[PDB]
Design a protein around this ligand. Structure first.
Ligand code: LWE
Length: 160
């Protein structure tokens, strides 16, 4: 049930797992990188904001953070503060299976894009992962810059 636009936001509510991570700056998503953050859940805060809870590593320990995301003037776009100012939007989702997010980090050193694949479960179809890899390459993210997190510690032991 792939939705490609006009997403119902309340249907992306609830728990998510981070599965694949991609960026045109690999350091951002590798171990210790500012964007190596594992989603826990998404909830509707208001008619125009979301709240994400996510895990980061702090001195080796999985640590929960909360992020407030607001609709911008552009349709489908949200902003969020983390390692600077970010703009993100949904690329596509099957609400009960997976969601793909695109993010832009707007900083003065070098702007970069992030691509994220979440699943309702700690894994999804190889069909879904293939769809994501294709999007990444269409966005000129090299395959070396796509990381599979199902192999690594994604704080699953700490989600509570
Ligand atoms: C801070 C990062 C990791 C979060 C913010 C919200 C996005 C939908 C997913 C994402 O890139």
């Amino acid at each position: 049930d792939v939705v490609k636009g006009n997403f119902d936001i309340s249907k992306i509510s609830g728990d998510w797992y981070s599965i694949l991570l991609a960026s045109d700056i690999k350091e951002k998503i590798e171990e210790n990188g500012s964007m190596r953050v594992f989603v826990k859940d998404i909830e509707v805060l208001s008619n125009s904001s979301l709240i994400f809870t996510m895990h980061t590593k702090v001195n080796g320990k999985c640590t929960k953070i909360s992020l407030i995301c607001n609709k911008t003037e552009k349709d489908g776009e949200y902003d969020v503060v983390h390692d600077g100012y970010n703009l993100f939007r949904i690329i596509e989702t099957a609400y009960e299976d997976y969601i793909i997010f695109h993010l832009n980090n707007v900083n003065q050193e070098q702007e970069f894009q992030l691509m994220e694949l979440y699943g309702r479960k700690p894994d999804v179809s190889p069909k879904v992962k293939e769809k994501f890899v294709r999007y990444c390459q269409g966005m000129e993210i090299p395959k070396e810059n796509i990381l599979d997190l199902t192999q690594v510690d994604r704080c699953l032991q700490a989600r509570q």
